[PDB]
């Protein structure tokens, strides 16, 4: 079963760190490495928050602020967001890639809200 389960909404207080529990799945018959990627406001701006393929693709906006707390092998895709910001609020969608079609992007997303 292909899918990325992760919280719909998340509460976060400015300047503090937030962790997003994430977990994804796919059919045991899919052969295999695994690439992880997080996104902010995909529809519009769509900025690379995390990239395990090339940390160089990460939007500067997040560099040094968001890291992947995942166990690619254990199918955990947790996202850690250090130092929140009111601007940081938005919708995050996770995408993992294996092989040209064995790629998947979570339609749901996780909406993080930042307050003081």
How determined? X-ray
Say what the resolution is, in angstroms.
Answer: 3.3
CB 81 within 8 A of CB 92: no
Helix (H, G, I), strand (E, B) or coil at 73: coil
Domain ranges of the chain: 1-116
State yes or no: 5 annotated in a binding site. no
CA atoms within 13 A on the CB side of 102: 14
CA atoms within 13 A on the CB side of 103: 8
Q: Which residue has the tokens 């207080």?
A: 13
Give the residue among 91, 98, 76, 82 at the shortest CA–CA distance from 30: 98
CA 19 to chain centre: 11
State yes or no: 16 annotated in a binding site. no
CA distances from 97 to 1, 3, 28, 102, 115 (A): 15, 12, 15, 6, 33
Q: Return the CATH number of 1-116, one of 1.10.530.10, 2.40.10.10, 2.40.50.140, 2.60.40.10.
A: 2.60.40.10
State yes or no: 103 annotated in a binding site. yes
Sign, CA torsion 27/96/103/34: negative
Give the residue among 16, 10, 8, 9 at the shortest CA–CA distance from 85: 16
Q: First vs last Cα of the chain: how many Å apart? A: 39
State yes or no: 42 annotated in a binding site. yes
């Amino acid at each position: 079963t292909w899918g990325v389960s992760s919280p719909k909404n998340v509460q976060g207080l400015s300047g503090s760190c937030l962790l997003i529990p994430c977990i994804f799945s796919y059919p045991a018959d899919v052969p295999v490495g695994i690439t992880a990627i997080w996104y902010y406001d995909y529809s519009g701006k769509r900025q690379v928050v995390i990239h395990s393929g090339d940390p160089k693709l990460v939007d500067k906006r997040f560099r040094g602020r968001a890291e992947l707390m995942g166990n690619m092998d254990h199918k955990v895709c947790n996202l850690l967001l250090k130092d929140l910001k009111p601007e940081d609020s938005g919708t995050y969608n996770f995408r993992f890639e294996i092989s040209d079609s064995n790629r998947w992007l979570d339609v749901k997303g996780t909406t993080v809200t930042v307050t003081t």
